[PDB]
Design a protein around this ligand. Structure first.
Ligand SMILES: Cc1cc(OCC(=O)O)cc(C)c1Cc1ccc(O)c(Cc2ccccc2)c1
Ligand SMILES: Cc1cc(OCC(=O)O)cc(C)c1Cc1ccc(O)c(Cc2ccccc2)c1
Lengths: 114, 116, 114, 116
């Protein structure tokens, strides 16, 4: 699929499982419209968010509900969520990886050619 | 000061200089209200965004304009910005440092929260 | 396999391909002895480093030749290499992930139960 | 001072305090010679490790004792330490800040290199 999300937990050294993830596309009036969502699997992965036909060029936001995830582990977190905003440009499979800690997160993009 | 932002460049091993930073606060009607903004200095620091009086409890969004930064350097980066969103001062006033590390296709953000 | 290495490139947004990786186990006299090595694949992965029988408890070092990798891209790097040192403890597949930038690197461990 | 180390804790959103740091320099015979060592302060900073005179060209290793840090907090971390290895002063004297961010199963390290 053209867009995949992979989330890891830096405290336990494991995939971040059952993390809610919502994806939005920016519309003509500059608001975010829901596009896709899911929960990460047992391997911290979220596949089948979209298809090639639907994933057109545009500005996308991937919002990862980190706060609910830490709350379920009984750990006080800093961030309300993690939000990754990017332009999808035709020329390409996107993997958005995120590494979570209660007071920090990192995100990287892996952009590859089939 | 109660809120400070520090930005580094992981390609150039230097502070990220002249990076625009915009801070918003969630209003009663659930919309983002403009709160303060500024530019990182030669040391990659942004001080003086706010005051103890003005920086009340709330949900804040710190948006770091990573894209314009990379573009001025001739790089086409992945992200539009780096965005940090947090509830501030929920148990009384704290001092927040938002530290960000930038690469063209990655960023990290961390918070240092201390009680004066 | 019990030990896997995955390396990403934060400058290009891609797997880090053809990165030399050497693994060492700490011996009784506190020196590092070569244990395994390889180069990352087209997907930035290095599999088949060791087997369950051979990967006993001990202190391991994973040395990732980041400097040669940046040099091949024509980019000046800071670090001589990236070196991840850990205790492998029985109770477990280890993924060591690393995210590379010329002046920074991060590494995380994903430790999972088959 | 020419070499400074700054350490943060990503679990506690605070400086990493009382972290041991050992610095070595590669000798002529290719072995690591002890160069300087110290403990991070209440701000997670380690200053005064060396001087401009003493900090000559060479390959240096900065070893941050992350394991003892986590253990004193009751965590069993993954890594034995965080180790940064770099050629220093190859085009003349520079000032180096080694910044590290710590989680039990992860760490990041970055370098800020400036020309006084
Ligand atoms: C907050 C701060 C105080 C500080 O005081 C030292 C000084 O400059 O005198 C120095 C620095 C480089 C910093 C910023 C800083 C420290 C560690 C660090 O890892 C980072 C960048 C970072 C940001 C997110 C994830 C990993 C790294 C910045
Ligand atoms: C481990 C892995 C598995 C994976 O699925 C395939 C597999 O499990 O073999 C896909 C990816 C991109 C990865 C690597 C990865 C996942 C999350 C993540 O945040 C990072 C980057 C990172 C690495 C170290 C420190 C901070 C951030 C890499």
């Amino acid at each position: 699929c053209p867009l995949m999300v992979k989330v890891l937990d830096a405290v336990r050294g494991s995939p971040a499982i059952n993390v809610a993830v919502h994806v939005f596309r920016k519309a003509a009036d500059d608001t975010w419209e829901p596009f896709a969502s899911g929960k990460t699997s047992e391997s911290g992965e979220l596949h089948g968010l979209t298809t090639e036909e639907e994933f057109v060029e545009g500005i996308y936001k991937v919002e990862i509900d980190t706060k609910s995830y830490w709350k379920a582990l009984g750990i006080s977190p800093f961030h309300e969520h993690a939000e990754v905003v990017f332009t999808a440009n035709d020329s390409r499979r996107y993997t958005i990886a995120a590494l979570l800690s209660p007071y920090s997160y990192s995100t990287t993009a892996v952009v590859t050619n089939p």
